[PDB]
Design a protein around this nucleic acid. Structure first.
Ligand SMILES: Cc1cn([C@H]2C[C@H](O)[C@@H](COP(=O)(O)OP(=O)(O)OP(=O)(O)O)O2)c(=O)[nH]c1=O
Ligand SMILES: Cc1cn([C@H]2C[C@H](O)[C@@H](COP(=O)(O)OP(=O)(O)OP(=O)(O)O)O2)c(=O)[nH]c1=O
Ligand SMILES: Cc1cn([C@H]2C[C@H](O)[C@@H](COP(=O)(O)OP(=O)(O)OP(=O)(O)O)O2)c(=O)[nH]c1=O
Ligand SMILES: Cc1cn([C@H]2C[C@H](O)[C@@H](COP(=O)(O)OP(=O)(O)OP(=O)(O)O)O2)c(=O)[nH]c1=O
Ligand SMILES: Cc1cn([C@H]2C[C@H](O)[C@@H](COP(=O)(O)OP(=O)(O)OP(=O)(O)O)O2)c(=O)[nH]c1=O
Ligand SMILES: [Mg+2]
Ligand SMILES: [Mg+2]
Ligand SMILES: [Mg+2]
Ligand SMILES: [Mg+2]
Ligand SMILES: [Mg+2]
Lengths: 255, 259, 271, 276, 274, 271
DNA sequence: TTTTTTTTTTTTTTTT
């Protein structure tokens, strides 16, 4: 609250898992920590699932920790083909000839799935508790929560109690609310902390909020800005940096 | 359990990867979004009179003659006979439902009828989820068109979640048409205003539980209102969005041709 | 089941295809939109006091004498006696209600009953003396009288957003199930910047009160404009805003009022 | 049912066009040449700026319609109480300004001329006043039309009945009040004058400094110009008394525009016709 | 309910012999075309931000309280109670009290503080208010229970803190409080920003449509008085008074000129000729 | 809640038994008479013309030289940055502009001699970066017992009219009946035509951007002008725009800016 | 005992 001037005697004289791409994130929020609930809030088609899938790939090969996915947005094979194409630096699911040309398919399969690292998913709290106890998962990702006031808040309190009981890194993605006046978030508007559907617990029981903004109907729709909106451990919020998508490969890279 | 490890999944991916349907007119659509694919939900949104039903009816003609795929219509906006007379006139290069003399001059009616309806391609429609499940199971329909959803907040959201679950369970191409919202300040969409993704009635889940959004713009009270512009707003597969191309209507014939 | 195969539809199309009602005055209308057709919903718009009821009254007059079709008026805005007197004055070429030296002159000459059965001698016109009750009354007009044209004077006083949406869907379902020609008249909304509509401002398709459902479930929209406090408030403009069946829109023509008589007649005006 | 056929409506029309009609205005000639008076079952609305004479002209009209024409006039004035709007009519009848002079008030207290001026004006039951929820107001107006049998009813300052009522959205309340009031006026067939205000202009001159007022300047909603039969606006510039009349919408006739010029007399309070 | 106009003979006479205009001070030009203030009379007083609203209002409250016997109730919300009380005492003693620490230190020692206090507050003609629905209730308790004649409010924008509906409901409640009670009600409001031109604080003549908050404020007010002064010009203490609206008399325009005295705080009637 | 004039016999006598002087220039105190309990002071200039430097200098003068508890709420930067700014301003150096100067003071042990001379007397308090701010300022006023509270860069806290009007109303209600001097730093609106604020435009009172309620609840308004592009970039001008207490507006004096210690001195420039 | 869309009307400000 109120900080006295006597507690600045030495401070004037004055981590966890790291994020891949846009290096002003782990410079700013000091990476992810155990027991946290990270929210990734952006508009439609802004690259939420792509960013969290890149994070999941960089936390399953360079980190080696057991990663449990909850992709209720698409099937379990397409999200694996996206991982294989991302890892192999080549846009896989959107090129027609290469998908039958490479079938060395076992060579590209086993190089990234030789371990028992990744655990995909086709009640949900019991499934995540099983993924946490019987499998040793350290990163749990949930992509779509809007299908899973009072029932939203009870679900969020139950997820927060599960996270406090376990100590697992948890990344949950939800959507934005429809702007009522002016332009939209998809065309150059910064995301506020108010812009959240469902209820108001998304900015209360979470620990950090990451937003991505790009002008989709513009001259360069592949040049995002990343914004931190909340961070209980640091307080450093605002602009992180800029990334490009690199449409040949699909890796989000800062520049 | 419902857990699936990444190790025991080499078969299910191999049988999965072992473009899809194309769009006719303004060929910078399948140059941009690479045409339609399976299991999708496609939204076609424009203003009143902009040419939504004309575009989807031309697409339904072009997917039932050269493709031969089973097409299931749901034209809740109009009757079941006018939507067939428009297909007959469009296939026969003649503005049929507007010329009174030719409608009685041709009656060669069966000659124009059998050439396009000799197959079991098209299945029309005069609870709705059970009807669409029947049209998908007992008929083999690969394309399902729904002309109007606003006559069918939570009542739209639960309906869209159930439609997306049905599309996920079946793997059917599904096109759904809804309208634009009311603009508050400035010009209207009917006089040359570009469309943002905000312009959707009902709620905001329409842009979140879909896969692509296609919009048309034409200056109706202008000098040449027969020159549409097509805009792609969203594409989860590619990301390529923006102005695709132009189509002229060719008022004598009725075919949208790219020029 | 409600599925229909396209193969088993050869006969129902043949009995279906086996122009419609023309419009009177400003002959660029029926050249452009080709008149009304059975099973439509028509919108007529203008500013306040610009003559929407005046324009639809001439059409109800010309559709009852030259056509012979059953016409059902729904004058929610006024009484039945006043619109009956205005129809009599509009047919007999004489401004009736707006002249008191003649309203007592024709009742003593005995030719009032001559002018009465000259236009009301048939069973053409059916007036309405004022939601679900209105729908039941229009259904009884359609079934129990065989009406071809049903005119609704004013829709804004029916609502005493979702209640406008449900009403418009129900009216479209009624007019499609019975196939009756249905005309609906509404007003415009207050513009925020610039001039008002009454001094010659052209009307866009946004300017519709209540909600935006008035243009998404209607087949054609006709707007009429006239510079009221101008050089002359007689030369009116007619604009087609939307048409599903024909498509061609824009300015149709130019009419004058003929203040001595009151007939909207087309006149020569290029620009 | 209500499906009245056009054939079985003969004698009704014979008893409609034979009878009412008329009830001319005062102060100007061009007003009656365009609007052709006030008729039973209509709505005539008069607007001005702030403090421009939308009450003086109407009380001057209510003096003429209650004395020289015998019609029972009911004044629902809500700006002032019944003690002042009945006192100003006496002075306007006697061609003076009674409230604006403390000499003549004490003089008519002394000599007894107040009783002569009271019983000369109110010798016949022609003026019915009302003192100040929207429910009981229409009930008292229905009591004026049914029990008292009023022929002219003047409702002044409709802005006070939309602002003293607790409503979230004001536009629907104005619309519902206007359609219920027009339903009352059409069912009863009584002449009903309703007085409302104007709103703030966006830029340019102000309405109290000579701005030519248009029809879209009505304050509160757009239901005020859609359900009225006649709209008359008054415009002057503070020649601080030269007031002109503008017909904005005539539904009966078609002649609208500049009707004429009036001059307000600072001594008597009458709206005399001008020459210009 | 409704009444007939022939049962009013016993009250129209009773209103005819009751109502008396309370004369303004500082300028005779205001009282020439307004004839004062009566029972049931809402007077709006406005000028630019810092041009002398509360000073002229405080002078009017001082002259109607200690010289005319009217019981005056103030509801000053800009300042505290002791600050406006000290300013009333210093204004009545023709000095500038709170702007001088030496005089405030001097008058507490020689015992003339009570000499200045009891000469004003001995008759008990003034009442003060110490800081939406409870405010009108306390004003009703001030009117009925205490028996005050002229109620003065200051800085209406606190009570409204959508603003247009709130200020319209508030103006309707204050008009209903003023009418059918017989109480003078003085209301102070501010001015919105001019779009183009110069500022009101630099000498622009103020029009009628500068009253911020709604358009309903000048519709339910009976008499509107505006002040102006050019503090950046050659003569920064020569104010002008403009009567914008007068429902009773109908004469609007320039009233006169007043000169403000920097040493006594009494703005007096000047003799400037435009 | 209503108190009559008879109960104020000893309260007014309690009120008679002091303005905190403005340092840096004596031309301000000639026409402002300091600042009392409940004296809202608005301080503004152009974009980067030294609002934070002048207000931090006045807080440094009021804190360690006059014995007043000073509470800052700098939202432009965090706690340690403005702490380094206070220490480097008191010790007459330019601390955050040379890395050797930050390194020299810690290698010789004189860094602890600068903390204890400033923050050892408990006369300073800082705040770490909308209704949650007022509840903490209330605990700073009541619990800690401070006298001069400063808030900077109001655009962080704040349709940008209703929010700033409610904020200014709540701050005025907090500063009234408390006995606290609350200084608020704001900005100016952008110039549309003419010269800019970085060139020496003569400022008016209606330049407070966001609303018009910032000059209606402020008690003393001070504006600074610095011509960084002209001949003298180190000369500032102080203009009083509004004084409720006295009423004297215009140029107060002249001060010269320094690029050696960070301070700015009282000058005697001639116009 | 709570979050999101649609819509007509009155005011106070905002940019490149
Ligand atoms: C972020 C981004 C995506 N794209 C393209 C490629 C992506 O596969 C496609 C969409 O990105 P996705 O990350 O797949 O979007 P999403 O699944 O998170 O959306 P939602 O959950 O709201 O339905 O758009 C770009 O072209 N440039 C970009 O910067
Ligand atoms: C698309 C288009 C239509 N038209 C004409 C001919 C069409 O039959 C008519 C309307 O076309 P429709 O395709 O029927 O219009 P719509 O379905 O989008 O509108 P709604 O459902 O809201 O009523 O307009 C053109 O002239 N040029 C064009 O580009
Ligand atoms: C169309 C037209 C009408 N008029 C005048 C003469 C008629 O007596 C008068 C009647 O018009 P109305 O038909 O009553 O106008 P309206 O119904 O559109 O307006 P409202 O919303 O108030 O119902 O219009 C002209 O003068 N010139 C014209 O061209
Ligand atoms: C018309 C007119 C009136 N007057 C005087 C006569 C009256 O005393 C006063 C008009 O009083 P009102 O007519 O009662 O005021 P108003 O109705 O115009 O406005 P509102 O009720 O909304 O406040 O002005 C003139 O001096 N010159 C004029 O030209
Ligand atoms: C009347 C007058 C006062 N003054 C001085 C003494 C006044 O107390 C002071 C103006 O303050 P106020 O008299 O209080 O004026 P105000 O009500 O318009 O301001 P606010 O809303 O902010 O409270 O300035 C002048 O300089 N010139 C003048 O003409
Ligand atoms: Mg996604
Ligand atoms: Mg359609
Ligand atoms: Mg009409
Ligand atoms: Mg009046
Ligand atoms: Mg003041």
């Amino acid at each position: 609250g109120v900080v006295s001037a006597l507690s600045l005697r030495e401070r004037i004289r004055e981590v966890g898992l790291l994020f891949s791409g846009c290096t002003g994130i782990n410079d700013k929020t000091l990476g992810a920590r155990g027991g946290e609930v990270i929210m990734v809030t952006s508009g439609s088609g802004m690259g939420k699932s792509t960013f969290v899938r890149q994070q999941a790939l960089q936390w399953g090969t360079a980190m080696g920790k057991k990663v449990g996915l909850a992709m209720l947005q698409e099937s379990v094979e397409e999200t694996a083909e996206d991982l294989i194409g991302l890892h192999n630096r080549v846009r896989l699911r959107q090129s027609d000839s290469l998908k039958r040309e490479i079938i060395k398919f076992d060579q590209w399969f086993d190089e990234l799935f030789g371990n028992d690292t990744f655990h995909l998913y086709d009640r949900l709290l019991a499934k995540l508790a099983y993924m946490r106890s019987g499998l040793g998962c350290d990163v749990i990702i949930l992509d779509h929560i809007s299908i899973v006031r009072k029932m939203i808040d009870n679900l969020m309190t139950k997820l927060k109690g599960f996270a406090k009981s376990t100590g697992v890194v948890l990344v949950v993605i939800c959507h934005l609310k429809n702007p009522d006046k002016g332009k939209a978030h998809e065309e150059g508007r910064p995301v506020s902390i108010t812009d959240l559907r469902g209820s108001g617990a998304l900015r209360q029981l979470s620990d950090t909020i990451i937003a991505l903004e790009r002008n989709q109907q513009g001259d360069m729709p592949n040049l995002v800005l990343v914004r931190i909106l909340k961070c209980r451990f640091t307080g450093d919020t605002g602009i992180a940096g800029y990334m490009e998508y690199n449409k040949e490969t699909g890796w989000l890279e800062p520049s």
